[PDB]
Design a protein around this ligand. Structure first.
Ligand SMILES: NC(=O)[C@H]1CCCN(C(=O)Cc2ncc3ccc(Br)cn23)C1
Ligand SMILES: [Zn+2]
Length: 139
């Protein structure tokens, strides 16, 4: 679990969005596993606007942060789950690092700010949904 709080927005994994997120929907994209909802309070986070390919993510299943090298956002095949049919997830970045079911929502950050959130993984890999291209989050 986990979310990004920037301005009057809350960014969460679309498959983990609550009834309240859907009632305050701003934008959602099943192909990216992202959903953005509006908030009444001002958020605590800053979004990176860069092309960094190294950073640090939070891994809830270890209660620890790990440094990673990740691939640029791209279209990657994701096998069927209880949440989605088998499909290509877009804007996804992969890294070698631990992750297990329950780790979605952990933040990935570089020196410029928030880069993305954990969205898939397995077998010693971790996949992150990028948010750096969502320029409208800053207004
Ligand atoms: N983005 C998606 O389609 C995910 C939706 C929830 C379901 N998806 C998964 O990957 C579930 C899953 N099985 C093994 C692992 C290991 C690490 C992580 Br993080 C998640 N994991 C796929
Ligand atoms: Zn950066």
């Amino acid at each position: 679990s986990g979310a990004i709080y920037v301005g009057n927005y809350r960014v969460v994994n679309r498959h983990l969005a609550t009834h309240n997120d859907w009632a305050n929907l701003v934008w959602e994209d099943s192909s990216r596993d992202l959903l953005v909802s509006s908030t009444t309070a001002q958020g605590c986070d800053t979004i990176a606007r860069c092309d960094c390919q190294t950073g640090v993510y939070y891994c809830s299943s270890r209660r620890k942060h790990y440094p990673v090298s990740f691939s640029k956002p791209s279209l990657i095949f994701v096998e069927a789950s209880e949440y989605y049919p088998a499909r290509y997830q877009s804007h996804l970045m992969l890294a070698v690092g631990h992750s297990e079911p329950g780790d979605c929502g952990g933040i990935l950050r570089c020196q410029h700010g928030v880069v993305g959130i954990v969205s898939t993984g397995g077998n010693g890999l971790v996949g992150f949904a990028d948010v750096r291209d969502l320029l409208w989050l800053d207004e």
